[PDB]
């Protein structure tokens, strides 16, 4: 019912292993169609090497119910849905356990902006959420994961439109963008600055965050 969207989401998902952001069947990408009040997401239980546009699943933003698709949607669907509802500006969402972004997530630390590479895509510190409560973990887990992300941005006054990424404590990264492709790009850059962030810290443990002026020059220039 949204063949082109399914194609985009299919290609985005296929891009995950190509850019070494994932292994086995981890990761998932989705793209939204606000007008139709629905979003397309990777299916659960399908290898990337067999995946076809038909395997993509269409889900209702409002009810989280599957509108079209023979396969079961990704188990992360609730988190995606919550995010689309909470952040109006986003059009695509990417979830992976890319090694270095995940390393920061497991360490429960935020990735500070120390380079223009980072400044070009994330306006400031890429936030890491607080740990989830037992109530949250044992309740509607995936949906609750989404709430913890939204809470992180709200309590810290950060605009989801200027920070297309977040690290979920002890879990991994979540990125988003204008569309499926854009989200994938932010996901790869997120992994990139996560990697460089580890070693530049090692070289300079007391390195201060980059100059606000430089951060502004780069982020505001684009966007």
């Amino acid at each position: 019912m949204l063949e082109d969207l399914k194609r985009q989401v299919l290609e985005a998902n296929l891009a995950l292993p190509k850019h070494n952001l994932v292994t086995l069947t981890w990761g998932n990408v989705s793209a939204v169609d606000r007008e139709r009040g629905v979003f397309v997401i990777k299916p659960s239980g399908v290898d990337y090497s067999i995946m076809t546009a038909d395997d993509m699943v269409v889900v209702s933003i409002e009810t989280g119910e599957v509108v079209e698709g023979a396969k079961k949607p990704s188990s992360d669907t609730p988190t995606h849905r919550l995010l689309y509802q909470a952040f109006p500006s986003i059009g695509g969402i990417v979830h992976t356990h890319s090694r270095h972004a995940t390393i920061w997530a497991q360490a429960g630390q935020s990735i500070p902006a120390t380079g223009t590479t980072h400044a070009d895509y994330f306006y400031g510190t890429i936030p890491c959420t607080r740990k989830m409560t037992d109530a949250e973990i044992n309740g509607e887990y995936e949906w609750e994961t989404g709430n913890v992300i939204v809470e992180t941005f709200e309590k810290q006054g950060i605009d989801a439109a200027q920070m297309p990424g977040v690290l979920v404590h002890s879990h991994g990264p979540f990125a988003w963008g204008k569309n499926a492709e854009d989200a994938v790009h932010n996901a790869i850059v997120l992994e990139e600055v996560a990697y460089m962030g580890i070693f530049c810290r090692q070289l300079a443990p007391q390195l201060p965050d980059m100059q606000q002026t430089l951060l502004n020059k780069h982020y505001l220039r684009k966007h």
Copy 2:
């Protein structure tokens, strides 16, 4: 005599270099057939690029004697055999010297669970064995290596069915699963969490193990 099993084991072995879990001729995979009281394992002295299903060797679980095969079985056969005998639930075993899991093994330290990636495959700390005694090293080495692994799980009260992996002090990782393929997957994830475990420790040297609730949510959800 077990053509399909030989095919599975052949493919599993071939997967080792594809996933960069090994170099040269290191590593070996085997799968069991309880009813026939036998297991199929990689041959010793054969490059992965020349290996064929016929090269796989069939070995008796009870006697450790070669039941069928023109080639010599992997020198690690005794360890595999011991493990099949000791852990009834396992159907496949993988041994590699994958860089990061091996780094932990040489450091003689256990990989703590600090992420959901880990929680999805290993129910808790991936154990590292104690050093082997000179008696053990100079006796039936490979067989004794198997005993040290079993002893590790017993003295620490860990269920082999919930912890499909172990690190042998100063040597390398050993993984297992329901079958050849499943064992290979656990082997690759083991390497993965080993890698992330190194750097998340660097970022947070005092990082506590992940929340028991989160560990439970993830491991118990599957399995």
Copy 3:
């Protein structure tokens, strides 16, 4: 108007992703033609996988105006131009955000010469610039970036002909050479010594710079 030069610059740019010096669309290479008072540089907004020799842009060294080309030149053109004007000897320039060189840049530290690998291409410490002032960042940024590089070499008395590389604080590496190809080679070696520099420091935090005699033997031997 300089088909062969465009070919060289096209190939050089295409080499960036091949040698894993870049991702997405980052990076850019240019080569000069002193006699014609012009230089050819990568275009802005074109994927490496679609790039053709026609996409290359010809720019005036003196006016920085586009002499030929349907596409917009790289946003880094001003930095390139400034460098060609300031350093007469250079014939090619490469800019990338290659992970390890960039790690040093974000750490704001210079890469010391600790190996003959380094000695063969850089005569001494590969300099990292000071931070740029707000005036510089908010003025003609790219052009000013070039000035900060030149100032670095002048105040430190380093000959651009013996040090084909520099790290721009919080940004990334810039390399150059006799031509497009030569610059690319220096860029890859720069990344290489940046990588080894990180870990040899970890192994030996108090390691002194390599023997001046060894540095001289290697650099002076070639060049």
Copy 4:
């Protein structure tokens, strides 16, 4: 005049980039023919992608003079020659600047045996030479590099037949074996244990060298 040897040496050299032991034109492999009193080595100034068996150069062990070949021999020829003369048992030599072995070399530290991976190929600590004197550096450099290696093994009482590798302070690794292929294998394993050696140290800074019994079990088993 030794077509088969030239083929072997050609393939060995070509293996260097395949196993990521080198970049650009670094590295070189040679194999000897004691009876003919000559050795075949990679040529200087030829890309790996263009190299053919004819490009290999034949050199006299006794005079170091080129016996056959249109191209100039590797600038490292003297070091190779010296080594063949000093160590009768070796039949092949490999020199590379493989990242991790080179990291140890630049740090001027020896790689301790902490794993069976290492034990299978190197009987003990892989030695790193002392720094070379100015007299040595400014004299017959390459030949002198060979002398420093031999001196290292002699003063430390280490048998070249049991330690197919060495690190030259501030330079890089040198490996050898029964033949070209065997030397290449030792070179790749040397890089491997160098890599793991870096991080297992990070995990366990006070980790003692592996048990002598385990080292013996593994090295003596083979060889």
